Design a protein around this ligand. Structure first.
Ligand code: ANP
Ligand code: ANP
Ligand code: PRO
Ligand code: PRO
Ligand code: MG
Lengths: 261, 259
């Protein structure tokens, strides 16, 4: 019963079948679906008449090519996961349908929140994500859109985007889903070995009780577990970080006062 | 009968009060209307049930400050003109309206056609225009967009923009309106002096005979008029050129065989 639009043409026909009198939620993803994804969907299903999920791994937002090839995909499973949530439409285009001409027109952010943290760390990542998210919104024309708090600046950036471009959509920000350790669910977590999860869980032991008072000391702890701490910083009440375990790269942010978990 | 909407909110309630059975044409402009502009509008009135003209001078497209200070305002004369055309809606917003938070998000082109001609001589300009046109379209949501062939690159660029961003609007291209001399109707012309105006026509009488076989010579000819030629080239079947007369900056493009 879930419909699958494999290309834009299919999706357009579906999309122009629905009335305006009714509510369309949209959850975009790169697939390899986990409990975090699933939470956004559920919430979408609670608030809307039609739920659209897209799965596209957008090339232009990967600054790291090996990351791009390394990126997990299991579509047949994602479809099964998606159909067991009674998702109405899976939009699953190819690069060729999103970028018929290649990437010739791009959103380039100039803001402070764009030059820090994830923005400094992955150059061009934000441009790419902003370009695809604009295109996805234009295609899906949703009433409601669901985003994880996990990628915080992503949310800010998309909030500005829909404002600046006069896109009529509510943005709902969903809380980050975590493991008991406090470790946030991530698709790239599939790529980490048993040895790494050990480290990862160690890191979160450290984070779970720590002051955040002294940041240089914490880096030292985290770097000692074998992961490479990339950035860690305080903004308002909130801590942000990124780090590598092996070749797998993970980000997190949470309220300083409460978290992770 | 013409609604003048000086802000987005006013404009929205107007935009969304309209039926699907009505076709909306849009003619974006920077104001200071001349017959070039009119020609576009006369063509929109003919193909549409509702015509929307906008006047916004977009700061973001200007790569020269004095060009921006220079840029001609006749707002009241423009309202008049737009009224004797029986234009339905005049949308003329302010900067706060269009860039509520400043200019944070930009359309940036990477293609050759944005790296040549007007693109070299006006850095930042194409990104500026693309951003405003995107906003303008996202706001007006029209069926038909009317653009002049005079800004050729821009036309090409807006054609890309529309296709890349999945906006359903037809692009309709309209022929350059000219003075008898062949000089293209232009807003900045209202800045030419009476003698500068005669220099323009000299330049165009020179263009009216050239086989365009030697451009350095055509160049020296143009420059001997007092003008300062910025560039001239053939790409495909056409000439593109731009030049200065004093402070005023003008451009053209046409088939090798400006009538
Ligand atoms: N643990 C999570 N809790 C809540 N939302 C999440 C979580 N993880 C991801 N999301 C959101 O799901 C959407 C898709 O994430 P996704 O695009 O698939 O790529 P990613 O962030 O680079 N790798 P991943 O960690 O799986 O998201 C985004 O809005 C994410 O913020
Ligand atoms: N002489 C002309 N003939 C036909 N169309 C024109 C002419 N001049 C301008 N237009 C078009 O009218 C629309 C608005 O132009 P405009 O906003 O005034 O920017 P512009 O290129 O600086 N125009 P201008 O300064 O008047 O030459 C654009 O699509 C133009 O290409
Ligand atoms: O462009 C993307 O892929 C990001 C990921 C979550 C939704 N938006
Ligand atoms: O209106 C504008 O912003 C310019 C001139 C017409 C098309 N682009
Ligand atoms: Mg994913």
């Amino acid at each position: 019963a879930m419909i699958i639009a494999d290309n834009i043409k299919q999706f357009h026909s579906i999309r122009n079948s629905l009335i305006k009198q009714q509510k369309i939620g949209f959850v975009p993803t790169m697939g390899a679906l986990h409990n975090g994804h699933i939470s956004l969907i559920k919430k979408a299903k609670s608030e809307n008449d039609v739920v659209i999920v897209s799965i596209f791994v957008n090339p232009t937002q990967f600054n790291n090519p090996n990351d791009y090839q390394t990126y997990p995909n299991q579509l047949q499973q994602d479809i099964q996961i998606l159909a067991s949530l009674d998702v109405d439409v899976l939009f699953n285009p190819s690069e060729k349908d999103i970028y018929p001409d290649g990437n010739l027109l791009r959103i380039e952010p100039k803001l402070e929140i764009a030059n820090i943290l994830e923005g400094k760390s992955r150059p061009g990542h934000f441009s790419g994500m902003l370009t695809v998210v604009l295109k996805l919104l234009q295609i899906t024309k949703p009433n409601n859109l669901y985003l994880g708090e996990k990628d915080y600046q992503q949310v800010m950036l998309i909030k500005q985007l829909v404002k600046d471009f006069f896109i009529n959509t509510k943005i709902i920000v969903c809380p980050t889903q975590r493991q008991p350790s406090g470790l946030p669910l991530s698709s790239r977590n599939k790529n980490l070995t048993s040895t790494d999860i050990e480290i990862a869980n160690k890191i979160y032991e450290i984070l779970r009780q720590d002051d955040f008072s002294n940041l240089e000391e914490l880096t030292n702890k985290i770097n000692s577990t074998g992961a490479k701490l990339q950035y860690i910083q305080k903004l308002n009440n909130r801590i942000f970080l990124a780090f590598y375990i092996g070749k797998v790269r993970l980000i997190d942010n949470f309220l300083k006062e409460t978290g992770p978990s």
